[PDB]
């Protein structure tokens, strides 16, 4: 013609997608992306972080030196996986404030043990039990030393151990609760024992309590476990006139990125930087709805399963 | 949206434009044609790329924390442990909901703005020589071949050159 | 606001418009008249309705939580319980304040946008047959009865029909 | 005329209201809505949730079996209301009182199941003038005060958990006032209580000494709990001072809680409860109280927030 | 910006304008001149001032709280205290980031808006008598002295007085 | 001419600044302001709040009455500053739940003490130690009264003390001797006990005999416990040996008071916010100095810089 028409416009697609704005509950855009990670990998990836399968062993069992946990003696981890099936198989015990010790040890990322030359004069050492079998014979926790009367004497034990290193030492010890007054006088001389574990700045005294408990693995007696952190320059002192379950050395505390997690999911050769009880997940999204329990470089856990971020204009097709 | 271009005076999108996000279609003395505008398209893409990285800093390494599942009931301490975690999750969940509504509103508005910006740009070039058909289309009152149309798209079009011709064609009429 | 229609070139609102939020007043060969625009009214209302529900999830049931009042001095644990609750309340307080500012800014801008869109819509139909008076008003250079006004606000108006009459009235002057 | 005029516009109101934006501290819009609930109903509504008025009784007293709390014997709740007038009337302490209270509050019941504990060689049902049931000396109904029978005090009693749920066992130890009283009530000069399961244990030693008179008594009883898991067994060992359990409480997982308030219960319906009473549900936020139960608005510091539900209001000159 | 005025159709800013934020430059029979527009300048600044006080309440007084640094390893309670602070810092860190981006966006957008509004205000005054050049400049088709330009800047410019003169000058042409 | 040209525009500045929006990572504006306080004042300002320099003393020692802390005897504070080179110089002790009592005392905001006329019949008072020197002579915590056998007796102490005021905090303890020989020598009975009670609560502590590492030449230890007596209630103390007795009470205040660990000096200036790094300015909403704060403080955040645009986009010539 003698004229011309020039039209302006924009693109559109066939596979539109609905998003949420401030103006509209649902509106069609050309493209959008998912902001919430919903699927896990079904497995835990062991590249990126040092992952340790606890298998039949809890973390505490592993550090105490329960016979069926022997393989863990020299183990270290970024993340320790505890399984439901885990069981204890040594002398029956309890730890007052069990969760804290589990937490402290978990953070330290190791159960490596350093033996020390303690002198226990006038007593017999290495007490064993049928409730704790190492392969064939009666045994006991490998990191503890059950002390009993030698001859017909249990002298008041007064032992010392100085911390001349530049790190904190963690000492694990315990006390034995016998089942009867007859048992209390047979293994130790005195009718009533006690253990006082002290430093220059702290102290704990535990009194044993005689009496029958439910039979566990043959025995009705019990041991209660306690801990002590000795600072560099300080000095561990143990005082006991009976019932002491002595330490054989110390654990080195480490300021680290280590932790512990409960999961029944398999461990596999794989790469991911984020771990949940359901398995490893992807990092690429800002949010996830898999699990509130996470370890590593993880997206933020939120209630919602899907969130769509628009990456294009409104999609307006032919009418 | 707020500018009333996309799904407004521009009736619909062109599914047959795979070339870009915004552009032109035209009929002249050489037939019909289509071309995309790369400056507008790029201006939109640049605002939409890395959009979330501007607000929420890249995911962070976190290690040992608190326990969030329990076997034994314990009372006070466990009550607190749960409440802390419950509180954190409800607040992040809110941040996420708000952020998506926010960024999406922004994305609709800026893409709608780029369409309006390109129309206005073209309108200001054509001056008196053209008519806003209310369609998103321009009635150009002179002979405009492909080179002439490209000059509109490049922004080199000189309206003075065509003014005289345009005034004739325009004012052919009156009763 | 950003478009400068409401409290801008449109000098004030009409207290005597109760049919809708946006609309028209006109003077013609049949006198004066008023009519609301329903699409604009609805366009805005639909964005204001359930505005908050797009951001805040429907309030959720909580049951046994922590203790928040105390009648005994305790130390460590109570400090923690108080801090946790204080942390929470301040964060939600921030949220509530930010959300209200955002949404209200959105409301003001989108309502101003609707007014401006309707103006442009009306303008694009009239083409050369009319004149922006700057008042939010249009000078229509031809006899336009009530049916012809209806023609404009229904969007069925044909400017070609009145073009020659419009030119004659427009170009009457010049000295 | 030969021409026409057409003007565009928007509506205004006479009853304008001020809101806050990002651009202005105060601007007038045609309409706004309150987002913060600050008004309470002034009462706790009996409906929707199951409300138990504690009246003169604390939750703890009601589960222990304090005589003046007998009416609560069989009660369950969604929410238990503890009044500030509440008093004890049976003298005890509970280490970690707050926890036990929490555990019971959450469980939502003080319904008790009696078991056949056998206590050979001791006399049962110890009573006290500090704890009157009706007219005569009595004691907590859920606890069993054991003393010397004849001239001796032998105790090694078992009780397995054959059920498929956890059992909560409330027990105690008696702290006498003088060495003279210890031996008179329980032959041994020094007693003990060892309550254990296969997985845990607690031993408590009685502390002899004079305390201030409470309801004519200078002695005390300290209270403890033990949770027994399905398949596990409860064992109680003692050579003196034991305040024996009479059975167990069933641990539930529920919506149940407890709340301190002096506001009255009334015939009414709401879904959210505060110490100030029930509050309305329709608003996102609320300024009544940080303590809530049910389907509640979020608690915030500010008492008013105005959400614009209309355009900028522009009346004439 | 979304209006395409600043760094859009207006090519660049004026460093030599120090009286205000938005204003005018002109050439006429009395040479060239520059003047600020105080009403536009004020409208921008009023929105920018106290911007943050609308969202964030005056800094909170806080006294005794919880311990946030530890010399001994304790396990469970220390884990909780650490986690609570971690959670709080991260949520505020997010708030701060979002708020800065949100408000900055608002600033860019409202300043751009004011430029456009002043342009539009000026265009509506000039009616048929002027020509939008796309430079952000108007070509006025009549002799317009400093008193005449002044009248545009105040908003008293009567376009009917120059209309005839403007029609003569404009329509001088035709092929 | 016969025409005019009127151009519209906006201002620009020579050197502009970069900010972040929702649209751009970096964009130049005419003017911006910092929103994060990252610089501290290097010292703790002595003004606005009331600052008490702990010097050589921990709060706990200032309240127990450690001889080298005698100067703190009548003191109250808004904020108590604990220095990292503080030390104990009295009898070696431990407080189970040290952290909580430190918090309670800190919050109350005073170590001011009120003497009460406790009668201790049959025992000798004012027990002294070489570990706790008052300048030159053997001494003991001023707020604590160490009781020992008189002549050849230690009768079961049964003392009472009503609270007729409209909460009193009592500090007391038990002494753990080093050997059995020492235990009997000081408090006849071979086994000691301390029962501190009220109408609503009670505590009993048995002493533990044994050697502990020498601290200032002593192997014995004191353990410190506290009790809160309510109005209308009554403190009772029963003991047949080993009691480290209270001398009176501390008044418990609901206060704006706290305690802070810092080694930064105290100086003459004015500020409303204190951190371990010293005082900070108050004018910004956020801060990156320290998560530990006291007073009117900006919210602590991870980022060290955030710029709020206060001008339009800056578009320089060409
Ligand atoms: C205080 O009260 C408690 C609770 O009643 C008593 O503890 C019980 O003591 C009895 C008697 O010793 C225990 O009974 C014994 O259990 C042993 C282990 O058996 C368990 O495992 C097997 C499977 O291998 C199951 O069949 C069984 O149910 C148990 O779970 C057995 O070694 C014993 O059986 C053997 O003994 C007889 C002779 O006695 C021999 O001919 C055989 O070799 C036979 O196999 C016996 O059954 C009982 O387990 C304890 N219960 C608890 C809960 O601890 C305390 O003894 C009591 N204390 C006092 C009075 O001081
Ligand atoms: C260690 O030290 C404490 C403190 O001194 C002793 O405990 C006090 O013991 C005495 C008696 O031994 C108690 O006094 C008795 O108790 C009642 C006091 O009640 C108060 O409140 C009532 C309200 O109901 C008021 O009416 C009253 O005025 C009191 O304020 C009195 O009712 C008793 O009177 C009865 O006994 C006397 C004989 O003593 C009879 O002749 C009368 O008829 C009457 O029935 C009496 O006064 C005192 O309350 C105890 N105080 C506390 C805090 O426990 C320990 O005994 C002591 N322990 C030792 C040495 O081992
Ligand atoms: C249980 O076991 C512990 C550990 O063995 C015993 O406690 C130790 O007891 C000894 C002797 O009583 C203490 O002896 C002290 O050590 C001195 C060494 O020099 C210095 O040592 C430290 C660190 O450098 C300094 O802080 C301190 O001031 C000393 O100057 C000895 O020299 C001292 O004893 C005396 O010896 C000299 C002769 O060599 C005499 O001339 C002096 O009179 C002097 O007093 C000094 O007091 C040792 O410190 C204790 N160790 C700890 C860790 O406390 C318990 O006695 C034991 N308990 C029992 C068996 O019940
Ligand atoms: C059916 C019957 O009457 N059988 C008895 C049987 O009781 C007894 O076995 C011993 O019983 C005593 C209880 O008085 C202990 O249970 C012994 O347990 C062992 C163990 O753990 O296996 C032996 C072990 O050498 C002991 N170790 C040490 C360091 O002392 C431990 C230890 O004393 C306890 O665990 C402390 O709680 O106990 C158990 O052998 C047999 C043989 O004596 O005689 C039958 O008549
Ligand atoms: C003024 C005067 O001479 N009064 C005495 C009066 O003390 C005495 O009453 C008895 O006093 C003893 C103290 O030795 C107890 O307080 C007795 O109290 C009861 C109780 O609590 O009611 C009696 C009850 O039967 C006891 N129950 C059991 C299971 O033993 C308890 C119990 O022993 C304590 O509570 C343990 O702490 O004590 C009270 O009867 C009377 C009668 O002898 O003589 C007056 O002359
Ligand atoms: C060479 C030599 O060994 N000479 C001894 C010398 O050891 C001894 O000194 C005393 O040793 C005993 C150990 O049983 C105490 O440690 C004494 O310490 C004091 C102290 O300074 O703290 C003396 C003080 O007067 C005591 N105060 C009271 C109220 O009893 C305390 C207190 O009993 C203990 O701390 C309790 O744990 O102990 C220390 O003087 C002297 C004793 O005269 O004899 C030489 O022959
Ligand atoms: C619409 O947009 C989405 C993204 O919002 C597009 O899908 C996604 O595209 C991204 C980026 O192009 C892909 O990321 C990839 O990252 C790896 C690095 O690990 C790199 O090697 C690849 O080259 C790529 O950049 C991502 O795979 C993809 N995501 C999904 C879930 O498919 C989509 O293609 C867009 N569609 C259209 C029509 O534009
Ligand atoms: C502007 O102000 C308020 C809020 O925008 C308007 O009042 C509210 O309007 C809602 C509409 O959703 C009404 O809700 C009603 O609820 C009842 C049940 O209680 C139901 O029967 C109705 O069908 C309806 O859904 C309600 O009247 C009211 N809500 C309030 C006050 O909380 C008001 O109408 C507006 N004013 C003007 C002049 O437009
Ligand atoms: C963990 O313990 C279980 C059960 O004790 C082990 O399973 C046993 O495997 C051995 C063969 O080596 C046999 O004694 C039995 O056939 C199995 N017993 C049962 C009950 O299944 C298992 O091997 C252990 N797992 C690890 C990783 O050491
Ligand atoms: C709760 O306790 C109050 C106060 O102790 C009881 O009210 C008393 O009731 C008696 C009747 O036995 C009246 O003679 C008194 O006047 C009341 N005392 C006071 C101080 O007012 C009330 O019985 C108890 N509540 C319930 C629900 O049983
Ligand atoms: C850029 O903006 C800053 C911050 O708004 C200006 O400094 C402020 O100026 C106001 C106006 O009088 C003063 O009241 C404040 O004291 C200042 N604010 C702060 C936070 O200190 C600054 O003057 C501006 N700079 C330029 C070059 O325009
Ligand atoms: C804090 O303790 C130090 C060291 O224990 C005290 O400094 C000593 O003071 C005396 C005089 O009072 C001097 O003779 C010593 O030389 C100082 N010793 C050292 C190592 O410097 C100091 O007095 C104490 N501080 C306060 C404020 O009392
Ligand atoms: C939409 O369809 C195209 C063409 O088949 C495809 O490449 C694109 O990935 C789709 N968009 C999605 C999956 O978001
Ligand atoms: C006047 O104002 C309010 C807006 O706040 C509106 O809801 C109401 O309907 C108006 N009229 C009245 C209360 O009569």
Tab-separated table of C-alpha atoms in Angstrom, chain D residues 29-268:
chain	number	residue	atom	x	y	z
D	29	UNK	CA	-7.412	5.333	52.158
D	30	UNK	CA	-11.120	4.662	51.589
D	31	UNK	CA	-11.094	1.581	53.817
D	32	UNK	CA	-8.888	-0.411	56.215
D	33	UNK	CA	-9.128	-3.487	58.462
D	34	UNK	CA	-7.554	-4.265	61.864
D	35	UNK	CA	-4.949	-6.997	61.801
D	36	UNK	CA	-4.252	-7.138	65.545
D	37	UNK	CA	-6.716	-8.627	68.019
D	38	UNK	CA	-6.423	-6.652	71.257
D	39	UNK	CA	-9.874	-7.274	72.766
D	40	UNK	CA	-10.443	-10.443	74.805
D	41	UNK	CA	-13.842	-12.054	75.474
D	42	UNK	CA	-13.238	-11.559	79.225
D	43	UNK	CA	-14.032	-15.215	79.920
D	44	UNK	CA	-12.816	-18.715	79.041
D	45	UNK	CA	-15.323	-20.468	76.756
D	46	UNK	CA	-16.334	-23.986	77.753
D	47	UNK	CA	-16.881	-25.027	74.143
D	48	UNK	CA	-14.704	-26.321	71.372
D	49	UNK	CA	-12.027	-27.479	73.858
D	50	UNK	CA	-12.482	-29.534	77.029
D	51	UNK	CA	-11.705	-27.217	79.920
D	52	UNK	CA	-11.041	-28.427	83.462
D	53	UNK	CA	-11.278	-25.805	86.199
D	54	UNK	CA	-8.670	-26.741	88.816
D	55	UNK	CA	-10.449	-24.578	91.429
D	56	UNK	CA	-8.663	-25.159	94.762
D	57	UNK	CA	-6.321	-27.739	93.306
D	58	UNK	CA	-3.005	-27.691	91.500
D	59	UNK	CA	-2.531	-30.232	88.725
D	60	UNK	CA	0.151	-31.976	90.863
D	61	UNK	CA	-2.057	-32.200	93.995
D	62	UNK	CA	-4.878	-33.611	91.869
D	63	UNK	CA	-2.727	-36.420	90.550
D	64	UNK	CA	-1.081	-37.162	93.919
D	65	UNK	CA	-4.512	-37.551	95.516
D	66	UNK	CA	-4.664	-34.656	97.986
D	67	UNK	CA	-8.044	-35.274	99.776
D	68	UNK	CA	-9.585	-31.913	98.831
D	69	UNK	CA	-8.794	-32.814	95.197
D	70	UNK	CA	-10.740	-36.072	95.217
D	71	UNK	CA	-13.292	-34.782	92.672
D	72	UNK	CA	-10.548	-34.780	90.003
D	73	UNK	CA	-9.839	-38.499	90.560
D	74	UNK	CA	-11.238	-39.594	87.180
D	75	UNK	CA	-10.831	-36.420	85.138
D	76	UNK	CA	-9.396	-35.750	81.681
D	77	UNK	CA	-8.873	-32.446	79.874
D	78	UNK	CA	-7.804	-30.635	76.736
D	79	UNK	CA	-6.759	-27.720	78.979
D	80	UNK	CA	-6.381	-27.674	82.748
D	81	UNK	CA	-6.892	-24.249	84.350
D	82	UNK	CA	-4.755	-23.634	87.443
D	83	UNK	CA	-6.128	-20.893	89.703
D	84	UNK	CA	-3.882	-18.730	91.880
D	85	UNK	CA	-6.067	-19.438	94.971
D	86	UNK	CA	-5.079	-23.120	94.767
D	87	UNK	CA	-3.515	-24.549	97.923
D	88	UNK	CA	-1.956	-27.786	99.153
D	89	UNK	CA	-3.613	-29.542	102.078
D	90	UNK	CA	-2.014	-32.937	102.541
D	91	UNK	CA	4.163	-31.259	103.202
D	92	UNK	CA	6.137	-32.421	100.179
D	93	UNK	CA	8.661	-31.414	97.569
D	94	UNK	CA	9.353	-32.696	94.077
D	95	UNK	CA	12.787	-32.213	92.555
D	96	UNK	CA	12.069	-31.091	88.972
D	97	UNK	CA	8.452	-30.245	89.899
D	98	UNK	CA	8.067	-28.215	86.689
D	99	UNK	CA	8.927	-31.268	84.578
D	100	UNK	CA	6.538	-33.684	86.258
D	101	UNK	CA	3.795	-31.022	86.007
D	102	UNK	CA	4.641	-30.638	82.290
D	103	UNK	CA	4.590	-34.427	81.695
D	104	UNK	CA	1.163	-34.752	83.394
D	105	UNK	CA	-0.248	-31.605	81.763
D	106	UNK	CA	0.685	-32.960	78.351
D	107	UNK	CA	-0.698	-36.436	79.094
D	108	UNK	CA	-4.068	-34.846	79.833
D	109	UNK	CA	-5.315	-37.190	82.562
D	110	UNK	CA	-4.934	-38.088	86.250
D	111	UNK	CA	-6.868	-41.330	85.776
D	112	UNK	CA	-5.116	-44.003	87.852
D	113	UNK	CA	-4.856	-47.782	87.539
D	114	UNK	CA	-4.333	-49.700	90.771
D	115	UNK	CA	-1.929	-52.650	90.769
D	116	UNK	CA	-1.500	-55.431	93.320
D	117	UNK	CA	1.794	-54.557	94.985
D	118	UNK	CA	2.682	-56.961	97.812
D	119	UNK	CA	4.642	-55.548	100.736
D	120	UNK	CA	5.663	-58.395	103.015
D	121	UNK	CA	6.702	-57.600	106.590
D	122	UNK	CA	5.716	-53.930	106.832
D	123	UNK	CA	2.503	-52.137	107.829
D	124	UNK	CA	0.624	-50.218	105.139
D	125	UNK	CA	-1.570	-47.135	104.794
D	126	UNK	CA	0.342	-44.611	106.912
D	127	UNK	CA	-1.833	-41.628	107.866
D	128	UNK	CA	-1.191	-38.085	109.141
D	129	UNK	CA	-3.024	-35.199	110.834
D	130	UNK	CA	-1.537	-32.978	108.128
D	131	UNK	CA	-3.692	-34.787	105.582
D	132	UNK	CA	-7.379	-35.001	106.593
D	133	UNK	CA	-9.921	-36.901	104.476
D	134	UNK	CA	-13.329	-35.778	105.649
D	135	UNK	CA	-12.893	-36.089	109.407
D	136	UNK	CA	-9.997	-38.528	110.018
D	137	UNK	CA	-6.244	-38.697	109.406
D	138	UNK	CA	-5.385	-39.741	105.870
D	139	UNK	CA	-2.698	-39.458	103.176
D	140	UNK	CA	-2.267	-38.978	99.411
D	141	UNK	CA	-4.657	-41.502	97.828
D	142	UNK	CA	-2.163	-42.596	95.137
D	143	UNK	CA	0.689	-43.253	97.587
D	144	UNK	CA	1.210	-45.864	100.293
D	145	UNK	CA	3.177	-44.932	103.429
D	146	UNK	CA	4.967	-48.045	104.718
D	147	UNK	CA	6.206	-48.439	108.312
D	148	UNK	CA	7.605	-50.977	110.831
D	149	UNK	CA	5.447	-54.051	111.478
D	150	UNK	CA	5.919	-55.495	114.957
D	151	UNK	CA	9.620	-55.070	115.685
D	152	UNK	CA	11.162	-55.260	112.188
D	153	UNK	CA	11.251	-53.729	108.698
D	154	UNK	CA	12.597	-56.199	106.084
D	155	UNK	CA	11.564	-55.023	100.550
D	156	UNK	CA	12.187	-56.432	97.091
D	157	UNK	CA	9.041	-56.100	94.978
D	158	UNK	CA	8.648	-56.463	91.211
D	159	UNK	CA	6.029	-55.356	88.634
D	160	UNK	CA	6.337	-56.004	84.885
D	161	UNK	CA	4.941	-53.810	82.107
D	162	UNK	CA	3.071	-56.313	79.916
D	163	UNK	CA	1.049	-53.563	78.224
D	164	UNK	CA	1.814	-51.869	74.887
D	165	UNK	CA	2.206	-48.369	76.393
D	166	UNK	CA	4.480	-46.543	78.847
D	167	UNK	CA	3.604	-46.584	82.538
D	168	UNK	CA	4.297	-43.617	84.796
D	169	UNK	CA	4.999	-44.545	88.428
D	170	UNK	CA	4.817	-41.860	91.105
D	171	UNK	CA	6.622	-42.793	94.294
D	172	UNK	CA	8.418	-41.119	97.169
D	173	UNK	CA	10.678	-41.161	100.204
D	174	UNK	CA	9.919	-39.878	103.711
D	175	UNK	CA	12.373	-37.527	105.469
D	176	UNK	CA	11.767	-37.788	109.241
D	177	UNK	CA	12.472	-35.013	111.763
D	178	UNK	CA	14.786	-36.739	114.284
D	179	UNK	CA	17.001	-39.836	114.669
D	180	UNK	CA	14.454	-40.956	117.280
D	181	UNK	CA	11.684	-40.940	114.656
D	182	UNK	CA	13.638	-42.865	111.996
D	183	UNK	CA	14.204	-45.940	114.201
D	184	UNK	CA	10.693	-45.761	115.688
D	185	UNK	CA	9.089	-45.878	112.218
D	186	UNK	CA	11.688	-47.939	110.341
D	187	UNK	CA	14.034	-49.953	112.584
D	188	UNK	CA	17.203	-49.204	110.558
D	189	UNK	CA	19.039	-45.979	111.480
D	190	UNK	CA	19.715	-45.380	107.781
D	191	UNK	CA	17.183	-46.318	105.084
D	192	UNK	CA	17.194	-46.167	101.265
D	193	UNK	CA	14.993	-46.475	98.172
D	194	UNK	CA	16.294	-48.039	94.962
D	195	UNK	CA	13.755	-47.895	92.142
D	196	UNK	CA	15.112	-49.420	88.950
D	197	UNK	CA	14.281	-50.875	85.574
D	198	UNK	CA	16.444	-52.811	83.122
D	199	UNK	CA	17.572	-49.482	81.657
D	200	UNK	CA	17.614	-46.996	84.568
D	201	UNK	CA	17.851	-46.530	88.340
D	202	UNK	CA	17.426	-43.956	91.096
D	203	UNK	CA	18.533	-44.205	94.712
D	204	UNK	CA	17.446	-41.682	97.308
D	205	UNK	CA	18.627	-41.509	100.923
D	206	UNK	CA	16.336	-40.067	103.629
D	207	UNK	CA	17.631	-36.817	105.115
D	208	UNK	CA	16.928	-36.561	108.843
D	209	UNK	CA	16.340	-33.114	110.377
D	210	UNK	CA	13.819	-30.604	111.702
D	211	UNK	CA	11.915	-28.459	109.215
D	212	UNK	CA	9.351	-25.686	109.783
D	213	UNK	CA	5.908	-26.908	110.846
D	214	UNK	CA	3.497	-27.340	107.972
D	215	UNK	CA	0.025	-28.381	109.142
D	216	UNK	CA	1.488	-29.489	112.493
D	217	UNK	CA	4.231	-31.623	110.913
D	218	UNK	CA	7.998	-31.097	110.711
D	219	UNK	CA	8.715	-34.122	108.518
D	220	UNK	CA	8.637	-34.106	104.723
D	221	UNK	CA	8.141	-36.420	101.786
D	222	UNK	CA	10.083	-36.022	98.525
D	223	UNK	CA	8.462	-37.284	95.340
D	224	UNK	CA	9.983	-38.970	92.282
D	225	UNK	CA	8.787	-40.653	89.094
D	226	UNK	CA	9.814	-43.592	86.894
D	227	UNK	CA	8.654	-44.393	83.361
D	228	UNK	CA	8.491	-48.127	82.560
D	229	UNK	CA	8.638	-49.122	78.884
D	230	UNK	CA	6.615	-51.991	77.308
D	231	UNK	CA	8.390	-55.283	78.020
D	232	UNK	CA	10.421	-53.688	80.816
D	233	UNK	CA	9.976	-54.421	84.534
D	234	UNK	CA	9.679	-52.134	87.592
D	235	UNK	CA	11.744	-53.093	90.644
D	236	UNK	CA	11.565	-51.431	94.067
D	237	UNK	CA	14.249	-52.132	96.676
D	238	UNK	CA	14.107	-50.541	100.142
D	239	UNK	CA	15.177	-51.141	103.734
D	240	UNK	CA	13.262	-48.132	105.058
D	241	UNK	CA	11.490	-44.830	104.378
D	242	UNK	CA	9.743	-45.844	101.107
D	243	UNK	CA	6.528	-44.119	100.110
D	244	UNK	CA	5.277	-46.862	97.803
D	245	UNK	CA	3.245	-46.421	94.605
D	246	UNK	CA	-0.267	-47.901	94.410
D	247	UNK	CA	-0.334	-48.339	90.633
D	248	UNK	CA	0.424	-46.394	87.457
D	249	UNK	CA	-0.646	-43.527	85.218
D	250	UNK	CA	-1.089	-44.062	81.478
D	251	UNK	CA	1.113	-41.717	79.387
D	252	UNK	CA	-0.858	-40.238	76.477
D	253	UNK	CA	0.262	-38.266	73.443
D	254	UNK	CA	-2.333	-35.538	73.081
D	255	UNK	CA	-3.222	-31.910	72.568
D	256	UNK	CA	-3.410	-31.495	76.361
D	257	UNK	CA	-1.792	-28.711	78.355
D	258	UNK	CA	-2.132	-26.567	81.479
D	259	UNK	CA	-2.515	-22.821	81.995
D	260	UNK	CA	-2.523	-20.378	84.925
D	261	UNK	CA	-5.544	-18.075	85.039
D	262	UNK	CA	-8.070	-16.489	87.374
D	263	UNK	CA	-10.592	-15.689	84.639
D	264	UNK	CA	-14.039	-17.441	84.881
D	265	UNK	CA	-15.237	-20.269	82.600
D	266	UNK	CA	-18.503	-19.491	80.798
D	267	UNK	CA	-21.002	-20.869	78.244
D	268	UNK	CA	-19.308	-19.699	75.078
